[PDB]
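haha ok so turns out i had the wrong file open the whole time. this is the CORRECT one, sorry everyone. sequence first:
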Amino acid sequence: GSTSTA
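then structure:
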């Protein structure tokens, strides 16, 4: 799984 925010 992966997650990113900006």
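The chain has no helices and no strands.
again sry for the mixup
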